[PDB]
């Protein structure tokens, strides 16, 4: 059950992401992904793949940050999912 290993990895990526996300996005006129608190909620619906479109990126890097949260998140939930199936 080295799943907690992903929980760790992801929660960081969520934070890592939300910090860069705002950094990459600001400066780009019209971006709304420009404050930590929210960017953080973005990073979650993104890593959980729920994507509501309430917020998202428009700058090449913000998008690079995105792609990384998504994956890591898909990866994370995968391992954490697989683990739950074994011990149950």
């Amino acid at each position, epitope marked *: 059950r080295a799943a907690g290993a992903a929980t760790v990895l992801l929660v960081i990526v969520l934070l890592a992401g939300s910090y860069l996300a705002v950094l990459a996005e*600001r400066g780009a*006129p*019209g971006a*709304q992904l420009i404050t930590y608190p929210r960017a953080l909620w973005w990073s979650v619906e993104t890593a959980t793949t729920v994507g509501y479109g309430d917020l998202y990126p428009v700058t090449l890097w913000g998008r690079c940050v995105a792609v990384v949260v998504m994956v890591a998140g898909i990866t994370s939930f995968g391992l954490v999912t697989a683990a739950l199936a074994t011990w149950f």
Partner: antibody
Amino acid sequence: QVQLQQPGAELVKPGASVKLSCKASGYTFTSDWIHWVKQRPGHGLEWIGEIIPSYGRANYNEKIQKKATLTADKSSSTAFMQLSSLTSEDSAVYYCARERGDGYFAVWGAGTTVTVSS
Amino acid sequence: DILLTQSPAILSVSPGERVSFSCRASQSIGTDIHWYQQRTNGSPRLLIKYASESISGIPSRFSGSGSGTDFTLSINSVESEDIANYYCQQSNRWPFTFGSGTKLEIKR
């Protein structure tokens, strides 16, 4: 205690440049952004630009001619705004302000009155 | 960029009367509006954040409301110390922008 300290005034001859300073104290976070706002006498507040000390990146108001260059010294917790090639149009009070990355200016400096004259 | 319209530019009220400052955004900005007070020769001071959130240290007299494109800053029972210029500021989209300001005038 005063969170943001700015010098009272700066006299600059037309065409010359000046470097304004903003010394910050109190809690400091990696998410802090230091903003600069210009206000001409009798007029409103105009956003100039912002900088994130923890990373060093700066953004500027695209709607106005770029007169400023922002930098920050982490060790001295001081932010700087270099204004170059000034004219009387640049005469105004320049405020620095701190934002905790959450959208509002929690605190403002007292402002530096810049006068461009010979 | 988001344009913030503050009209009227001057508001005249009698002592102890309730007053309301208006701020209209060119597009919907949710509740990402903040209000500042600036007295003669003073620096701006945060009064209300995110349209209606109180700031510690500010008199209960001050309150805000609205969402979307229309916002209001209200003062219950105005007094002399409230004489100043009031500005709104948005943080929904980059770059942050300021309204042009409304001056409060008291008719004594």
